[PDB]
Design a protein around this ligand. Structure first.
Ligand SMILES: [Cu+2]
Length: 109
């Protein structure tokens, strides 16, 4: 987890919406079991691998309850890709590294 911005509702406008470039935000909570657990190792790899192309960040919805409403998240994990203030694309549930790389490659072009 060294490269992964830990977000709060207070920091989201600054860290995400005012940032240059792309950032992938993982919405999660401790009560999400296996599907959240399954993507957390892969995100450390992606954050490493897309260094300078993309920032990965996590927001725990329990501890931070006002963000997922403004973007309509129904379930966790949900991954939202932001490019310069805007939602470019959404991926819901657990997925493999290979299909997470397909989602980021198609959208960082
Ligand atoms: Cu790390």
């Amino acid at each position: 987890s060294d490269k992964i911005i830990h977000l709060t509702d207070d920091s989201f406008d600054t860290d995400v919406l005012k940032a240059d470039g792309a950032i992938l935000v993982d919405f999660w909570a401790e009560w999400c079991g296996r599907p959240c657990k399954m993507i957390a190792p892969i995100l450390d790899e992606i954050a490493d691998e897309y260094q300078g192309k993309l920032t990965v960040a996590k927001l725990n919805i329990d501890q931070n309850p006002g963000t997922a409403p403004k973007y309509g998240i129904r379930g966790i994990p949900t991954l939202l890709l932001f490019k310069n203030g805007e939602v470019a694309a959404t991926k819901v549930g657990a997925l493999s590294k290979g299909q997470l790389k397909e989602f980021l490659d198609a959208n960082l072009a």
